[PDB]
Amino acid sequence: MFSIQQPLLVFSDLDGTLLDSHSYDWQPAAPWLTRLREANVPVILCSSKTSAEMLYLQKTLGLQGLPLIAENGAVIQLAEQWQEIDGFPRIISGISHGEISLVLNTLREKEHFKFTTFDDVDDATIAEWTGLSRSQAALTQLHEASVTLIWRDSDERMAQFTARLNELGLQFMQGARFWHVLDASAGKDQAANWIIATYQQLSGKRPTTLGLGDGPNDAPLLEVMDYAVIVKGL
Amino acid sequence: IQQPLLVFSDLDGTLLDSHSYDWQPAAPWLTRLREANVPVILCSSKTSAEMLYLQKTLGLQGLPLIAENGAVIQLAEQWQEIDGFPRIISGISHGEISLVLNTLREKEHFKFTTFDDVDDATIAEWTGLSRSQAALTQLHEASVTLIWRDSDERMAQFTARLNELGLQFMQGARFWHVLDASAGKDQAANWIIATYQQLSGKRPTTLGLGDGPNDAPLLEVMDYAVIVKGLN
Numbered sequence: 483m484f485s486i487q488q489p490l491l492v493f494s495d496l497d498g499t500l501l502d503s504h505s506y507d508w509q510p511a512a513p514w515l516t517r518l519r520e521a522n523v524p525v526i527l528c529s530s531k532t533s534a535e536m537l538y539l540q541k542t543l544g545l546q547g548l549p550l551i552a553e554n555g556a557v558i559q560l561a562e563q564w565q566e567i568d569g570f571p572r573i574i575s576g577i578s579h580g581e582i583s584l585v586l587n588t589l590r591e592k593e594h595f596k597f598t599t600f601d602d603v604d605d606a607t608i609a610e611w612t613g614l615s616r617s618q619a620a621l622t623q624l625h626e627a628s629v630t631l632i633w634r635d636s637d638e639r640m641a642q643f644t645a646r647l648n649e650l651g652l653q654f655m656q657g658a659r660f661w662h663v664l665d666a667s668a669g670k671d672q673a674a675n676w677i678i679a680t681y682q683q684l685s686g687k688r689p690t691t692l693g694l695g696d697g698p699n700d701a702p703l704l705e706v707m708d709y710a711v712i713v714k715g716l
Numbered sequence: 717i718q719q720p721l722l723v724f725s726d727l728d729g730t731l732l733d734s735h736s737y738d739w740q741p742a743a744p745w746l747t748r749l750r751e752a753n754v755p756v757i758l759c760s761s762k763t764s765a766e767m768l769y770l771q772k773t774l775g776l777q778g779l780p781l782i783a784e785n786g787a788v789i790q791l792a793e794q795w796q797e798i799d800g801f802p803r804i805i806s807g808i809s810h811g812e813i814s815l816v817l818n819t820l821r822e823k824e825h826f827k828f829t830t831f832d833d834v835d836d837a838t839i840a841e842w843t844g845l846s847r848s849q850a851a852l853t854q855l856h857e858a859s860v861t862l863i864w865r866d867s868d869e870r871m872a873q874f875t876a877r878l879n880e881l882g883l884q885f886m887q888g889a890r891f892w893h894v895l896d897a898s899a900g901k902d903q904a905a906n907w908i909i910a911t912y913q914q915l916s917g918k919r920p921t922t923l924g925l926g927d928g929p930n931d932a933p934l935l936e937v938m939d940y941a942v943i944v945k946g947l948n
């Protein structure tokens with residue numbers, strides 16, 4: 483008899499632990515993550531990276547067709563098998579990359595905040611900044627619902643900048659190396675919540691969830707998990 | 717330096733006064749846009765001499781422009797620090813193209829007449845321009861304008877020969893143009909956009925204005941693109 487298994491979901495926010503940095507289309511984790519997928523232990527990649535970058539990374543890890551959380555929760559990729567879910571294939575914040583760029587330029591032109599976004603440079607410069615190839619650097623440039631930037635001003639100028647972003651319905655998010663601007667009402671936890679709720683309605687059964695982070699700022703995502711671990715490579 | 721807001725205009729025949737002189741209706745408008753720092757970058761199949769003339773009558777002298785289907789790029793006045801200033805031309809010049817074209821005509825007997833093969837009065841007659849403007853239409857830096865006088869089958873073997881030699885055969889409204897195969901209005905536009913971006917430290921926002929479906933390549937690299945048609 484056909485049966486929908488209780489969902490056992492892994493939320494993975496492991497920048498620079500799980501991936502091989504210099505390595506290519508050939509990820510050491512792929513054989514492993516492939517067998518987990520086949521046993522129905524879905525690994526849901528969650529990241530500040532763009533949808534396009536995430537989707538390519540998902541494919542090289544053997545996880546294509548699974549949900550994922552991109553752009554800090556501003557973009558949610560739906561499972562391949564979720565055709566009937568409102569929002570399929572992808573849920574993007576109503577505040578696009580384009581409108582955020584408009585906002586950031588207005589603030590820069592008028593108030594003279596000092597910063598450089600990923601949009602202000604070519605992909606050879608992003609390749610240099612990130613250590614990616616030109617090609618991966620290109621996908622790192624295709625934001626849908628956020629902007630990545632380097633902040634080049636003082637802490638007090640940053641404070642007046644967050645405040646100004648906040649009153650416009652935007653948040654200013656600190657990642658490992660860069661800052662991110664996106665819809666204030668979006669977030670890795672919010673995205674995760676929605677994904678969990680979807681598995682729960684489809685299956686009829688409460689998902690059990692596991693979050694993997696590699697730092698203290700993974701807290702929001704990890705807070706909503708049943709089980710949460712910080713992992714440290716050797 | 718402020719965020720660049722750039723207009724790429726490929727609108728010869730909508731912008732320009734059909735009959736008129738050094739006196740262009742668009743000049744006072746475009747002069748004000750230039751003062752507001754909204755540069756209008758003219759883009760054309762027309763020659764560099766022609767386009768520099770038109771640019772000056774339009775109030776736009778000192779701004780970049782795209783001539784000869786991208787085989788010539790005039791740099792901004794203020795770009796003295798940019799490798800290639802004042803003008804970047806394809807390494808395949810008009811002289812070299814003329815050599816290739818004459819070799820094909822003499823050895824393979826393709827039937828065609830270039831703008832180099834006739835006098836100014838005959839160009840004025842073909843183009844409706846005055847003799848003096850026709851003279852500028854005749855100066856090419858990195859391309860050849862021609863009228864094809866052979867059959868379509870002969871034309872197909874001509875494009876192929878040109879392609880093998882690093883050259884493209886590009887149809888315009890009236891005439892054909894021969895130029896470096898690696899050049900384009902789009903390629904030249906990208907380079908200008910990238911230069912504004914390097915000098916400003918900010919992503920330029922770009923608008924393309926064209927007046928037909930033949931303007932696809934240029935309009936394609938723009939953030940915003942419109943077709944404009946004169947009313948009637």
